[PDB]
Amino acid sequence: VLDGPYQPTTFNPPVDYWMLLAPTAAGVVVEGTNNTDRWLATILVEPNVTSETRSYTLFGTQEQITIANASQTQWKFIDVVKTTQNGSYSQYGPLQSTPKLYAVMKHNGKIYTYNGETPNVTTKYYSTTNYDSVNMTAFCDFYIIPREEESTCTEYINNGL
Numbered sequence: 001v002l003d004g005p006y007q008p009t010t011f012n013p014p015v016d017y018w019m020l021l022a023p024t025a026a027g028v029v030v031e032g033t034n035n036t037d038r039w040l041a042t043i044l045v046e047p048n049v050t051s052e053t054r055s056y057t058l059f060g061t062q063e064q065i066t067i068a069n070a071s072q073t074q075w076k077f078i079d080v081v082k083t084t085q086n087g088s089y090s091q092y093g094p095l096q097s098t099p100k101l102y103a104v105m106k107h108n109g110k111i112y113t114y115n116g117e118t119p120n121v122t123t124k125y126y127s128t129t130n131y132d133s134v135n136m137t138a139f140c141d142f143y144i145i146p147r148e149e150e151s152t153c154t155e156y157i158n159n160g161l
């Protein structure tokens with residue numbers, strides 16, 4: 001089940017495996033693209049942030065994104081996505097988290113990520129062409145968990161390692 005921790009790297013994870021990310025600091029957590037119709041980066045925002053513009057390096061380039069976190073005590077993982085190379089980034093599906101864990105998976109023509117509020121999370125997805133060959137760059141330590149053991153992954157997202 002819990003295979004890891006692996007150090008930050010760029011690689012091509014197998015389909016139907018959750019990549020469980022364990023960031024320690026605010027900032028970019030993971031990014032991945034098919035270079036055609038899907039770019040996805042996940043940003044971790046600290047608790048209690050009123051609307052402000054921050055700079056992030058996404059896919060090697062500096063980007064300005066306006067972020068907020070309305071929670072007093074919980075972290076906020078935000079997926080920032082664009083659907084063409086020169087498109088603007090939009091924000092989707094936050095996960096408000098106490099344990100600071102997140103996960104992403106390539107499955108059935110989509111990229112899945114976690115969503116909602118710990119300790120009662122759900123999942124959401126994004127349709128992605130050539131989903132199986134998407135390389136991911138992790139900016140923190142990570143673990144690999146098969147989809148068959150999603151119940152274990154969900155437990156860690158909700159309650160921590």
Ligand SMILES: CO[C@]1(C(=O)O)C[C@H](O)[C@@H](NC(C)=O)[C@H]([C@H](O)[C@H](O)CO)O1
Binds near residue numbers: 083125126
């Ligand atoms: C086209 O419909 C879908 C999709 O991709 O299959 C449905 C999906 O539920 C939705 N996910 C979320 C989190 O909203 C997704 C995004 O809006 C879009 O991918 C962002 O680019 O759109």
